[PDB]
Amino acid sequence: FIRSLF
Amino acid sequence: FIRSLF
Amino acid sequence: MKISVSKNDLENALRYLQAFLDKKDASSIASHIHLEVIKEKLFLKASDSDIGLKSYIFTQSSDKEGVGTINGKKFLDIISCLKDSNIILETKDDSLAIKQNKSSFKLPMFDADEFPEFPVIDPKVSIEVNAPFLVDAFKKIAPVIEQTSHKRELAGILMQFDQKHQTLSVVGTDTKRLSYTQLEKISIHSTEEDISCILPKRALLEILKLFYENFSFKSDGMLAVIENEMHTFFTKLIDGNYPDYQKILPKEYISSFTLGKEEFKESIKLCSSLSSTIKLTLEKNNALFESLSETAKTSVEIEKGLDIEAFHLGVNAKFFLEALNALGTTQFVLRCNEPSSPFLIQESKISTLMMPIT
Amino acid sequence: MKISVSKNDLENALRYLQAFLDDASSIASHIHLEVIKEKLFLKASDSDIGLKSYIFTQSSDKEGVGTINGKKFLDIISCLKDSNIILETKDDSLAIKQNKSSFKLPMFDADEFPEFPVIDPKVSIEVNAPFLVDAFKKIAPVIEQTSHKRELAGILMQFDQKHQTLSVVGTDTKRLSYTQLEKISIHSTEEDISCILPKRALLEILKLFYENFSFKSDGMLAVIENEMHTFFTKLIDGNYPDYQKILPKEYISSFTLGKEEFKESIKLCSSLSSTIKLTLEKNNALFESSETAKTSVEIEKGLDIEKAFHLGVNAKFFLEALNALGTTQFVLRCNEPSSPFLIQESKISTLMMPITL
Amino acid sequence: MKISVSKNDLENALRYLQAFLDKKDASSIASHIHLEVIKEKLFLKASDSDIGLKSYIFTQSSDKEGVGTINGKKFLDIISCLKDSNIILETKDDSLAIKQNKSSFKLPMFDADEFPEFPVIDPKVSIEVNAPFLVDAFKKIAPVIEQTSHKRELAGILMQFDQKHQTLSVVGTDTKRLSYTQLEKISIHSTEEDISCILPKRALLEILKLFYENFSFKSDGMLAVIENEMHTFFTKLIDGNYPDYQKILPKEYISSFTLGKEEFKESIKLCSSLSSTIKLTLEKNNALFESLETAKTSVEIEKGLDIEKAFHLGVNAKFFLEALNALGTTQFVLRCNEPSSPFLIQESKISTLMMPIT
Amino acid sequence: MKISVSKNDLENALRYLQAFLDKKDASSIASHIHLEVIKEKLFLKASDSDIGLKSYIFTQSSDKEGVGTINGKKFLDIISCLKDSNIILETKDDSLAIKQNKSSFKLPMFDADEFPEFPVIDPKVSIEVNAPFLVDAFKKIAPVIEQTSHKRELAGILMQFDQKHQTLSVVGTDTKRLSYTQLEKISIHSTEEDISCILPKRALLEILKLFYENFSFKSDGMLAVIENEMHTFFTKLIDGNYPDYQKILPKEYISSFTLGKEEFKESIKLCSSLSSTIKLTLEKNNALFESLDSEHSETAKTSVEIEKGLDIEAFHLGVNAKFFLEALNALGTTQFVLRCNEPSSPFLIQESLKISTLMMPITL
């Protein structure tokens, strides 16, 4: 489960 | 098409 | 259990075993490779129900004997990542520990007593194979057999033992071509005189990877077990009656043409770039090939003129090539009656009967 | 064609052209043939991208034009011997001949093959160093062809004429990879100008170009040209996000770490899972995937930390970031475990979002 | 001087330079590679009087410009041991420092002002080469030329420029075969006189590694300089007068036979396994090959030759093959007068005149 | 004689046989390969007195059985030129005919009864080898042995059978390094208790190409015969007494250092680009490697970290690079043990938790 950078 | 040997 | 094994030996054993696993379902024991240390050998087994393989490698050290199980796919994954050095294998409770230097892995094991034992059969038929001819025949006949056939029985290769005449006939078909050979001088130790085993295509392709010469073949009509010094292999047979191939082989041919194998191979490859079916026209001093607005054509000269007054013949390119690949001679014989009737291909010893296109 | 003899120079030309083809009813499935003097010129295009190429002829008995199905043409040539092959037009057919083998294929009217675009460059550079294409190679993996954000489905080229800089930028929202090339003579009408090359185009550029080519764009197409090829691609319409506004200005820690040690450790754990827990201690780094993979590497040059620093990472992202580096060691800069972290050498940097737990 | 360069770029540059060194004597400056940083480029030179190469790689960083030398063989040895990462190069006094993470090397340098400068020539002749035809001709003619010839002038390939007719003739011979081609439509920037350059075989073989299309060729009768974007190459020329090849070419041939190249190649390979000379017998509808204990083979010629009696011809196998390798057509022409007289081989660019054996 | 054989099978058999020929002299019978068809097998033999090989391939047809000879080199040359189809082999008078399609070769034969027979020995010692450990040990020890030794007996590998303790010791040396291993649990069927065979290096290198597992080894003190299903191999043994290796092995070592194999390998390769001898400096948490004086201005240095700190007061050691590498190639573990006493005294290399190498250092 990954965070969104943009 | 090809007819069956049998 | 506690052993050290060489990375390359293990990886190699584990590659061959993958085919024998039910990898799709990791809940199953069938997804696991069964491990067993006896003296200086690690014995590896995998099985689904259809096929099975036992294999072994030698240990670099055997500090403790014992048994174990591990997910077969995951085991290979891990071993392929490690260095070309020794790898420690060791059981701890219900886990398998894999260690190499500072890298350590744990994997869960099933109870190894619930891994199914390999079958012991009472042979109805049994032969010892020292020549490569059987496995050469498998190799050459395998392409004509399709794994997913309308007729279940055709989905393998036939082994027809005739104890009386010491013959093992090997036969493959997909209804459009029939490829066959008969091996002479086989000491067939069997209960009945005649006995047929149909090996599934999947099993056949595994046999090709594992065996060549110096192995035993036993069957009991249900399973068939192949064994040599490194491996015991088993497969279920296809239940069913293979059709009587001898009844469909034409007894007589009007013509028989001696023709150059590589010339024909090359010509058929050429026309095959544009279409899978080819028109082949045999003339007295010439053979012409044409793809069947686009066109490929090519021709080869036949110096030794054929016994003709021209003969047209529609053929599947890939079938004709696979038939010629089965031959070891430099020239081949094509026997035919009418253009619409089956024709035979053989050496100038695997023969292929083929239905033309019409 | 009109009647040419030519080598398996041909096969090679035809392999490269396959990617530029489209449906055999379409003209776009055909390669356009043209003989001028001692050259056979080959073109393929499907609207988005296009390639012009040529080979020399072994003989040119007649000049002329033609078309042929591009896939079928390659199939036929790849079957022939390593000798000369005769090419010849006969009415609306292309004849391919070699010794006793002769092939016929139908041609479209070659006037209805679409022309390659002539653009008025808004921007234009000459590339002699390999750095641009090295940057494409390294940044390409982080870009995905099928992105929710249309503009992210390519690589950004950001020209700043004033400072002579070409910035190259890729992202998929989970990692941002970037580099800035100095000393580029940028011949451009505006000062600032951005081209987004599609991923598909980017992968073709990698096969065809390295050094010694021109790059021109007009904001709609971009044309790359060297002595052998003219290549064109449409650009992605849209505004690429301002990458510099997301780059953290300050990092609490910065750790100098061994590249191949980390690569090998990440490959190891990646055999059991795609995400890895990475624990940095003062003199040690440990990597962990009922199942477990673990492994550790020593760090002789002790890190500046009191408590150990845990960090969830995607294995393949971390590897691809380290493949972009040319140094033997790398720098990892991070603030909190949940915040983005940077990877760079002792030209390409990668900002990466971690995973939690 | 202080730079960082990529290991692969450097290693590659250094491999190509080895051939240009006098490695035999490490006391000599000629055993060294000259290093020079200008802006973002490291320029590398090696030379041993006869031949020379200048090359460059791009720098990953250029902290200081400067010059240096280093033993060329030892430099490659070191670089080939390092990792695929950047390598620091740096001068310290009269030493070159090579550094990559914890590994550091020192090597002694010569005064780089005493490294000889590459020649600047005033071109007597000059051409720009965009087609591959010249270098294709070098490749095909090179085998016929021997480095160690009794005749000094034959120890290279001839380039004969005729400005008047825009022709560059390329010619090779040992005294047993003469291979030649003439390139049309060359813009020869020279004086109106003819002008001949003989490139040594050693130089010729280096040209083949470095060049194909898109280069300049200049000569002044003493040196010849070849240049493209990556390299400047120089070689001394061979000083003699190459013999007038056109005077020994027969003007007329009694017979001319159109024959199949790959058939002849394969047949000659076959007989060559037992002897280097072959008896070749041409009949109307076939050609026979026999070693001169015994190899024989034959090929059919469908398109019958114009001959009443059969034509025998002794040939060197390897010469005949090398002549056929020069051809790009699928068939070839063999023209001969008597069995003992020279015979010609050519396509249906490169022709080979060959002396037979009796 | 009249057979057909597959081109690949034959070519392959003939490649292996080349090493057993006396190709130097084509007048000799020893330059020939002896051919023999029995049933569905073509048997091939080559020998030059010191070594010999028997091999076979299966026939695609056997129309007539018989014997023959042919020049072994020329036979391979011809077969390698032919196509991947069947090849006809046939005797006609005193010639061997090789045919394939339109290509036909003739070669002269010697009388095949004058081809020397392979030896039948009465085994003084005999073992059956199923594990790969013997041949693994040959492979790893072979580099240390030199074919052209001043001492005749060192020009091979030693096989020391001790029937009493079921041990086969395998030993190689060139006087500067001694490499050895002892295999346990060998059923040694022998007449005497102790018995030594010294195999020549040439023979040893051929054994490596032909054998791995599942073969017999018999010797009578003069020859040694190795046999499996495909091959019978023979070699003469080196007449002589191999020195007592056990008397030179140090019984005790002051220090023993557990060290990383691939780290050391890389570091030694690096410094070996400038000089063949290396100064190795062991510190508690670090090992350093430096090329030794080479041309005064040159230097290679590099270092590796040792996480598991060593137990020491720094230890310098001069070593031959290539010897140290060859010793580490013998090991299958990831880490190795270096045991030493003084800098000038021999040191030992072996695995961490088969093959050990004792090595003489260099000074300074």
PDB file of C-alpha atoms in Angstrom, chain F residues 5 7 11 59 62 70 93 98 135 157 159 165 170 174 181 185 225 229 263 272 278 284 301 328 342 347 356 360:
ATOM      1  CA  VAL F   5      25.565 -43.765 -38.249  1.00  0.00           C
ATOM      2  CA  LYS F   7      26.703 -37.480 -37.997  1.00  0.00           C
ATOM      3  CA  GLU F  11      31.618 -36.447 -34.607  1.00  0.00           C
ATOM      4  CA  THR F  59      24.137 -47.629 -35.585  1.00  0.00           C
ATOM      5  CA  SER F  62      24.090 -52.618 -39.468  1.00  0.00           C
ATOM      6  CA  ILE F  70      41.352 -45.056 -40.167  1.00  0.00           C
ATOM      7  CA  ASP F  93      39.530 -54.014 -49.604  1.00  0.00           C
ATOM      8  CA  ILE F  98      32.637 -42.671 -45.995  1.00  0.00           C
ATOM      9  CA  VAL F 135      36.179 -36.330  -9.655  1.00  0.00           C
ATOM     10  CA  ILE F 157      47.892 -36.707  -8.684  1.00  0.00           C
ATOM     11  CA  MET F 159      45.553 -41.783  -4.949  1.00  0.00           C
ATOM     12  CA  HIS F 165      40.290 -47.262   7.388  1.00  0.00           C
ATOM     13  CA  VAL F 170      43.782 -37.483  -3.124  1.00  0.00           C
ATOM     14  CA  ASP F 174      54.209 -28.524  -7.109  1.00  0.00           C
ATOM     15  CA  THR F 181      41.433 -34.236   0.527  1.00  0.00           C
ATOM     16  CA  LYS F 185      33.585 -44.631   3.501  1.00  0.00           C
ATOM     17  CA  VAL F 225      41.569 -48.628 -15.783  1.00  0.00           C
ATOM     18  CA  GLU F 229      28.710 -47.857 -19.493  1.00  0.00           C
ATOM     19  CA  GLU F 263      35.679 -10.640  -1.174  1.00  0.00           C
ATOM     20  CA  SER F 272      47.004  -9.333  -9.674  1.00  0.00           C
ATOM     21  CA  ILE F 278      50.498  -9.642  -3.144  1.00  0.00           C
ATOM     22  CA  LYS F 284      40.953  -6.787  13.384  1.00  0.00           C
ATOM     23  CA  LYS F 301      45.771  -1.411  -3.183  1.00  0.00           C
ATOM     24  CA  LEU F 328      39.865 -20.568  -2.914  1.00  0.00           C
ATOM     25  CA  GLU F 342      54.518 -17.070  11.539  1.00  0.00           C
ATOM     26  CA  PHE F 347      49.689 -21.429   6.009  1.00  0.00           C
ATOM     27  CA  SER F 356      42.510 -27.998   1.926  1.00  0.00           C
ATOM     28  CA  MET F 360      54.239 -21.430   1.300  1.00  0.00           C
TER      29      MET F 360
END
